[PDB]
CSV table of C-alpha atoms in Angstrom, one decimal:
chain,number,residue,atom,x,y,z
A,1,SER,CA,19.5,44.4,102.8
A,2,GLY,CA,22.1,47.0,103.7
A,3,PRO,CA,24.7,46.0,106.3
A,4,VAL,CA,23.8,45.1,109.9
A,5,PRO,CA,24.7,48.0,112.3
A,6,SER,CA,27.4,47.8,114.9
A,7,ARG,CA,28.4,49.6,118.2
A,8,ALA,CA,31.7,49.6,120.1
A,9,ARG,CA,31.5,47.1,122.9
A,10,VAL,CA,33.4,49.4,125.2
A,11,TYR,CA,33.5,53.2,125.7
A,12,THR,CA,30.4,53.3,123.6
A,13,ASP,CA,28.8,56.4,124.9
A,14,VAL,CA,31.8,58.3,126.3
A,15,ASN,CA,31.2,61.3,124.0
A,16,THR,CA,27.4,61.1,124.4
A,17,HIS,CA,27.9,62.1,128.0
A,18,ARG,CA,30.6,64.8,127.5
A,19,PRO,CA,29.9,68.5,127.0
A,20,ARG,CA,29.4,69.3,123.3
A,21,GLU,CA,32.6,71.4,123.4
A,22,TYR,CA,34.7,68.2,124.1
A,23,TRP,CA,34.0,66.7,120.7
A,24,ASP,CA,32.7,69.6,118.6
A,25,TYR,CA,36.0,70.6,117.1
A,26,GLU,CA,34.4,72.7,114.4
A,27,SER,CA,33.6,75.3,117.1
A,28,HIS,CA,37.1,75.2,118.6
A,29,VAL,CA,39.0,78.5,118.7
A,30,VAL,CA,42.7,78.1,118.5
A,31,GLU,CA,45.0,79.7,121.0
A,32,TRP,CA,48.0,80.9,119.0
A,33,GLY,CA,51.6,81.0,120.4
A,34,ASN,CA,54.4,83.0,118.9
A,35,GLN,CA,56.2,81.5,115.8
A,36,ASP,CA,59.2,83.7,116.6
A,37,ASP,CA,60.0,81.4,119.6
A,38,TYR,CA,61.1,78.6,117.2
A,39,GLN,CA,63.9,78.3,114.7
A,40,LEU,CA,63.8,75.3,112.2
A,41,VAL,CA,67.0,73.3,112.4
A,42,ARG,CA,66.6,70.3,110.1
A,43,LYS,CA,64.0,68.8,107.8
A,44,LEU,CA,62.9,65.3,108.9
A,45,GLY,CA,60.5,64.5,106.2
A,46,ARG,CA,57.7,65.4,104.2
A,47,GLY,CA,54.2,64.2,103.6
A,48,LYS,CA,50.9,65.1,101.8
A,49,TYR,CA,49.6,67.0,104.8
A,50,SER,CA,52.8,68.5,106.3
A,51,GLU,CA,56.5,69.0,106.4
A,52,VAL,CA,58.2,68.1,109.6
A,53,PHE,CA,61.3,69.7,111.1
A,54,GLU,CA,63.5,69.4,114.1
A,55,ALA,CA,63.6,72.9,115.6
A,56,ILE,CA,64.8,74.7,118.7
A,57,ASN,CA,62.8,76.9,121.1
A,58,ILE,CA,65.2,79.9,121.1
A,59,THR,CA,63.9,81.2,124.4
A,60,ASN,CA,65.1,78.1,126.3
A,61,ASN,CA,67.2,76.0,123.8
A,62,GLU,CA,64.8,73.0,124.1
A,63,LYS,CA,64.6,70.8,121.0
A,64,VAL,CA,61.1,70.4,119.6
A,65,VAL,CA,59.5,69.0,116.5
A,66,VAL,CA,57.5,71.3,114.2
A,67,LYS,CA,54.9,70.0,111.7
A,68,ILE,CA,54.0,72.8,109.3
A,69,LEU,CA,50.6,71.9,107.8
A,70,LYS,CA,50.0,72.0,104.1
A,71,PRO,CA,46.8,74.1,103.4
A,72,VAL,CA,43.7,72.1,104.3
A,73,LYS,CA,40.3,73.4,105.6
A,74,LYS,CA,40.1,74.8,109.1
A,75,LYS,CA,37.9,71.7,110.1
A,76,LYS,CA,40.6,69.1,109.6
A,77,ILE,CA,43.2,71.2,111.5
A,78,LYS,CA,40.8,71.9,114.3
A,79,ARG,CA,40.0,68.2,114.7
A,80,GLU,CA,43.7,67.2,115.1
A,81,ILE,CA,44.3,70.1,117.5
A,82,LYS,CA,41.3,69.4,119.7
A,83,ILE,CA,42.2,65.7,119.9
A,84,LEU,CA,45.8,66.5,120.8
A,85,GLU,CA,44.5,69.0,123.5
A,86,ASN,CA,42.0,66.5,124.9
A,87,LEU,CA,44.6,63.7,125.1
A,88,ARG,CA,47.5,65.8,126.3
A,89,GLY,CA,49.2,64.3,129.4
A,90,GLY,CA,47.7,60.9,128.7
A,91,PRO,CA,50.1,57.9,128.9
A,92,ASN,CA,52.4,57.8,126.0
A,93,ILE,CA,50.4,60.4,124.0
A,94,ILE,CA,52.7,62.9,122.2
A,95,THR,CA,52.6,66.3,123.9
A,96,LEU,CA,51.5,69.2,121.7
A,97,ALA,CA,53.5,72.1,123.1
A,98,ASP,CA,52.4,75.0,121.0
A,99,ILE,CA,50.4,76.0,117.9
A,100,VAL,CA,51.9,78.9,115.8
A,101,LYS,CA,51.2,80.5,112.4
A,102,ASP,CA,54.2,79.8,110.2
A,103,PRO,CA,55.4,83.2,108.9
A,104,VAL,CA,56.2,81.8,105.3
A,105,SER,CA,53.4,79.3,104.6
A,106,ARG,CA,50.8,81.3,106.7
A,107,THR,CA,49.5,77.9,107.6
A,108,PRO,CA,49.3,76.5,111.2
A,109,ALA,CA,52.4,74.8,112.6
A,110,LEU,CA,52.0,72.3,115.4
A,111,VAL,CA,55.0,72.2,117.8
A,112,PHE,CA,55.6,68.9,119.7
A,113,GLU,CA,57.9,67.5,122.3
A,114,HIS,CA,61.0,66.0,120.9
A,115,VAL,CA,61.5,62.2,121.2
A,116,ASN,CA,65.0,61.0,120.3
A,117,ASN,CA,63.6,58.2,118.0
A,118,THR,CA,65.5,55.3,116.5
A,119,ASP,CA,63.8,54.8,113.2
A,120,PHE,CA,61.8,51.5,113.3
A,121,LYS,CA,63.5,50.1,110.1
A,122,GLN,CA,66.7,50.1,112.2
A,123,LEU,CA,65.3,49.5,115.6
A,124,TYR,CA,63.0,46.5,114.8
A,125,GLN,CA,66.0,44.4,113.6
A,126,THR,CA,67.5,44.7,117.2
A,127,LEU,CA,64.4,44.2,119.4
A,128,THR,CA,64.4,41.3,121.9
A,129,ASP,CA,61.3,39.3,123.0
A,130,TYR,CA,61.1,41.5,126.2
A,131,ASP,CA,61.5,44.7,124.2
A,132,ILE,CA,58.5,43.7,121.9
A,133,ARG,CA,56.4,42.9,125.0
A,134,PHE,CA,57.3,46.1,126.8
A,135,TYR,CA,56.7,48.5,123.8
A,136,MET,CA,53.4,46.6,122.9
A,137,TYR,CA,52.2,47.2,126.5
A,138,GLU,CA,53.2,50.9,126.2
A,139,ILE,CA,51.2,51.3,122.9
A,140,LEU,CA,48.3,49.6,124.6
A,141,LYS,CA,48.3,52.2,127.5
A,142,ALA,CA,48.0,55.0,124.8
A,143,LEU,CA,45.2,53.2,122.9
A,144,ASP,CA,43.2,52.4,126.1
A,145,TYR,CA,43.6,56.0,127.1
A,146,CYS,CA,42.5,57.5,123.8
A,147,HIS,CA,39.7,55.0,123.4
A,148,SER,CA,38.4,55.7,126.9
A,149,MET,CA,38.5,59.4,125.9
A,150,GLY,CA,36.2,58.7,123.0
A,151,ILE,CA,38.9,58.9,120.2
A,152,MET,CA,40.0,56.4,117.5
A,153,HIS,CA,43.6,57.0,116.3
A,154,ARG,CA,43.0,55.3,112.9
A,155,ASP,CA,46.6,55.4,111.7
A,156,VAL,CA,48.5,53.0,114.1
A,157,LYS,CA,51.7,51.8,112.3
A,158,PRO,CA,55.4,51.7,113.1
A,159,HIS,CA,56.1,55.1,111.7
A,160,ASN,CA,53.6,56.6,114.2
A,161,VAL,CA,55.1,55.0,117.3
A,162,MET,CA,58.2,57.0,118.3
A,163,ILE,CA,60.7,55.1,120.5
A,164,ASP,CA,63.7,56.6,122.4
A,165,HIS,CA,65.1,53.1,123.1
A,166,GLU,CA,67.8,53.9,125.7
A,167,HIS,CA,65.0,55.5,127.9
A,168,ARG,CA,62.4,52.8,127.1
A,169,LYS,CA,60.3,55.8,126.1
A,170,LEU,CA,57.4,55.6,123.6
A,171,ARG,CA,55.0,58.1,122.2
A,172,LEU,CA,52.0,57.6,119.8
A,173,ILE,CA,52.1,60.4,117.2
A,174,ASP,CA,50.3,61.6,114.1
A,175,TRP,CA,46.8,62.2,115.2
A,176,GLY,CA,45.8,63.7,111.9
A,177,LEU,CA,43.4,60.9,111.0
A,178,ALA,CA,42.0,60.5,114.5
A,179,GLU,CA,38.2,61.0,115.1
A,180,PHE,CA,35.8,61.0,117.9
A,181,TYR,CA,33.6,57.8,118.3
A,182,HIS,CA,29.8,58.4,118.3
A,183,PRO,CA,27.7,55.2,118.2
A,184,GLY,CA,25.8,54.6,114.9
A,185,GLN,CA,28.0,57.0,112.9
A,186,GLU,CA,29.1,55.9,109.5
A,187,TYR,CA,32.8,56.8,109.1
A,188,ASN,CA,35.1,57.3,106.2
A,189,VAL,CA,36.9,54.1,105.3
A,190,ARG,CA,39.9,55.9,103.8
A,191,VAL,CA,42.0,55.9,107.0
A,192,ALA,CA,45.1,54.0,108.2
A,193,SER,CA,47.9,53.0,106.0
A,194,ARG,CA,47.3,50.1,103.5
A,195,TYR,CA,49.2,47.4,105.4
A,196,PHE,CA,47.4,48.3,108.7
A,197,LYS,CA,43.8,48.7,107.4
A,198,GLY,CA,41.3,46.4,109.1
A,199,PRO,CA,39.0,44.1,107.1
A,200,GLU,CA,36.2,46.5,107.9
A,201,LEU,CA,37.8,49.3,105.9
A,202,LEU,CA,38.7,46.9,103.1
A,203,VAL,CA,35.1,45.6,102.6
A,204,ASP,CA,33.7,49.1,103.1
A,205,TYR,CA,32.0,48.6,106.4
A,206,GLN,CA,31.6,52.2,107.7
A,207,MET,CA,30.1,51.7,111.1
A,208,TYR,CA,33.4,50.7,112.7
A,209,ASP,CA,34.9,51.7,116.1
A,210,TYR,CA,38.1,51.7,118.3
A,211,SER,CA,38.6,48.1,117.4
A,212,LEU,CA,40.1,49.2,114.1
A,213,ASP,CA,43.2,50.3,116.0
A,214,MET,CA,43.5,46.8,117.5
A,215,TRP,CA,43.7,45.2,114.0
A,216,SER,CA,46.5,47.7,113.1
A,217,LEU,CA,48.2,46.9,116.4
A,218,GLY,CA,48.0,43.2,115.6
A,219,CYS,CA,49.6,43.8,112.3
A,220,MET,CA,52.5,45.6,114.1
A,221,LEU,CA,52.9,42.7,116.6
A,222,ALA,CA,53.0,40.1,113.7
A,223,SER,CA,55.7,42.2,111.9
A,224,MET,CA,57.7,42.4,115.2
A,225,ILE,CA,57.6,38.7,116.3
A,226,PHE,CA,57.9,37.3,112.8
A,227,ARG,CA,60.6,39.8,111.6
A,228,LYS,CA,58.5,40.7,108.4
A,229,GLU,CA,57.6,44.3,108.2
A,230,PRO,CA,55.0,45.0,107.1
A,231,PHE,CA,53.4,41.6,107.7
A,232,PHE,CA,50.4,41.8,105.2
A,233,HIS,CA,52.0,43.4,102.2
A,234,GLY,CA,49.1,44.1,99.7
A,235,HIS,CA,49.7,45.8,96.4
A,236,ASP,CA,46.4,47.8,96.7
A,237,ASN,CA,43.4,47.8,99.0
A,238,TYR,CA,41.7,44.8,97.3
A,239,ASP,CA,45.0,42.8,97.3
A,240,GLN,CA,45.4,43.7,101.0
A,241,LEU,CA,42.3,41.7,101.9
A,242,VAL,CA,43.6,38.9,99.7
A,243,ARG,CA,46.8,38.8,101.7
A,244,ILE,CA,44.9,38.7,105.0
A,245,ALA,CA,42.6,35.9,103.5
A,246,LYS,CA,45.6,33.8,102.6
A,247,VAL,CA,46.6,33.6,106.3
A,248,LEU,CA,43.3,33.9,108.3
A,249,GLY,CA,41.5,31.8,105.6
A,250,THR,CA,38.5,32.5,103.5
A,251,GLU,CA,36.0,30.5,105.6
A,252,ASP,CA,36.1,33.1,108.5
A,253,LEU,CA,36.2,35.9,106.0
A,254,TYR,CA,32.9,34.9,104.5
A,255,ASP,CA,31.4,34.1,107.9
A,256,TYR,CA,32.1,37.8,108.9
A,257,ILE,CA,30.7,39.1,105.6
A,258,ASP,CA,27.6,37.0,106.2
A,259,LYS,CA,27.2,38.2,109.8
A,260,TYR,CA,27.2,41.9,108.8
A,261,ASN,CA,25.4,41.3,105.6
A,262,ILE,CA,28.2,43.0,103.7
A,263,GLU,CA,28.1,43.1,99.9
A,264,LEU,CA,31.4,42.3,98.4
A,265,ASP,CA,32.6,44.6,95.7
A,266,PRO,CA,32.3,42.3,92.7
A,267,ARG,CA,36.0,43.1,92.0
A,268,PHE,CA,36.9,40.8,94.8
A,269,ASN,CA,35.2,38.0,93.2
A,270,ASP,CA,38.0,36.4,91.1
A,271,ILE,CA,40.7,37.5,93.6
A,272,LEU,CA,39.9,36.3,97.1
A,273,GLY,CA,39.9,32.6,96.0
A,274,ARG,CA,39.7,30.0,98.6
A,275,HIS,CA,42.3,29.6,101.3
A,276,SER,CA,42.7,27.5,104.4
A,277,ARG,CA,43.4,29.1,107.7
A,278,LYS,CA,47.1,28.9,108.4
A,279,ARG,CA,48.5,28.1,111.8
A,280,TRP,CA,50.7,31.0,113.1
A,281,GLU,CA,53.5,28.5,113.3
A,282,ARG,CA,53.8,28.5,109.5
A,283,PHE,CA,55.6,31.9,110.0
A,284,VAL,CA,58.1,30.9,112.6
A,285,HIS,CA,61.7,30.3,111.4
A,286,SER,CA,65.1,30.1,112.7
A,287,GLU,CA,65.6,33.9,112.6
A,288,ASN,CA,62.5,34.9,114.6
A,289,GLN,CA,61.8,31.9,116.7
A,290,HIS,CA,63.4,33.6,119.8
A,291,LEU,CA,60.6,36.3,119.6
A,292,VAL,CA,57.8,33.8,119.4
A,293,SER,CA,56.1,32.1,122.5
A,294,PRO,CA,52.7,30.4,122.9
A,295,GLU,CA,51.7,33.5,124.7
A,296,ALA,CA,52.7,35.8,121.8
A,297,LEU,CA,50.7,33.7,119.3
A,298,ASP,CA,47.6,33.4,121.5
A,299,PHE,CA,47.7,37.2,122.0
A,300,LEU,CA,48.2,37.8,118.2
A,301,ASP,CA,45.4,35.5,117.4
A,302,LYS,CA,43.0,37.4,119.6
A,303,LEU,CA,43.8,40.8,117.8
A,304,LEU,CA,43.8,39.5,114.2
A,305,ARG,CA,40.2,38.7,113.9
A,306,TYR,CA,38.0,39.6,111.0
A,307,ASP,CA,35.0,40.5,113.2
A,308,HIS,CA,36.0,43.8,114.9
A,309,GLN,CA,33.6,43.0,117.8
A,310,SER,CA,35.6,39.9,118.6
A,311,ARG,CA,39.0,41.5,118.9
A,312,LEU,CA,40.5,42.2,122.3
A,313,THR,CA,40.0,45.7,123.6
A,314,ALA,CA,43.2,47.5,124.7
A,315,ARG,CA,42.3,47.0,128.4
A,316,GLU,CA,41.7,43.3,127.8
A,317,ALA,CA,44.9,43.0,125.8
A,318,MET,CA,46.9,44.5,128.7
A,319,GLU,CA,45.7,41.6,130.9
A,320,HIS,CA,47.0,38.9,128.6
A,321,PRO,CA,49.7,36.6,130.1
A,322,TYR,CA,52.1,37.7,127.4
A,323,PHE,CA,52.6,40.9,129.4
A,324,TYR,CA,53.0,39.4,132.9
A,325,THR,CA,56.7,40.2,133.2
A,326,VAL,CA,56.2,43.7,131.9
A,327,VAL,CA,53.4,44.3,134.4
A,328,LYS,CA,55.7,43.0,137.2
A,329,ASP,CA,58.6,45.3,136.1
A,330,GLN,CA,56.4,48.4,135.9
A,331,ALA,CA,55.0,47.8,139.5
A,332,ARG,CA,57.4,50.3,140.9
A,333,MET,CA,57.7,51.2,144.7
A,334,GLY,CA,59.0,54.6,143.6
């Protein structure tokens, strides 16, 4: 009485049927560019796995962004690089322009195209109903492409969706937690950022798939249409599932746990309690009602499901009526 196994319902065997070299990043041999082409201009931030800078290519004066890796095991570096190479040129996928050896850290530095981003903490306060539909559609093009290429992003959240708003230009970044999907594999559940973790991670169901990214996307859409970012604000990973349970209800939570024969950490016992499913209307108020439509709530509802097999795929989500106007506007004669 371990858990019931699961498979992705789409793109299930896309890596099965690729050459080993496509997904076997451990064997990948990096092609190094020249660090002396780039001069760091300004530090943009810092993380546990890297420091990130705006920089200039001094051979052509193009702005780029450099992520200097903290030291980390060839394998984790190779995985990010091979995924960025595989996905390069895909719709709304950040372009890896170069890979160099930083002359001070001796660690690898990844050099990306520059996107003139408005930080989401400022930009989300200004988005219109159409802007939310258009950028959700653009995120979905990147997620359908990477999923159809056999890759789960595993860290979908506003900070990883760069938007140059005046150009209606969006890129999905930070592929450092991404991994290739192979049916039957048991994955590490320590992925995504707390507020965007799917119930599968939170109840330690390891045999998950691309549908993880669709839960995280739904958390972004709720935060956008309701003006509450992040939407599910847990204090830790156990409280994160409590916060979801207070909205989706405990009835469907325990139906999912039953379906997959999951054993609940007994630390979840006194904390999940018992909660009705709430209507999405409970979250509508005078300051967000202009971003909410029946189409937005129907779409949201179909992403935010406990059972990962029941969530929309990215391709299915793109066909939802919520995006009809965006689909019309992008049907360009050229």
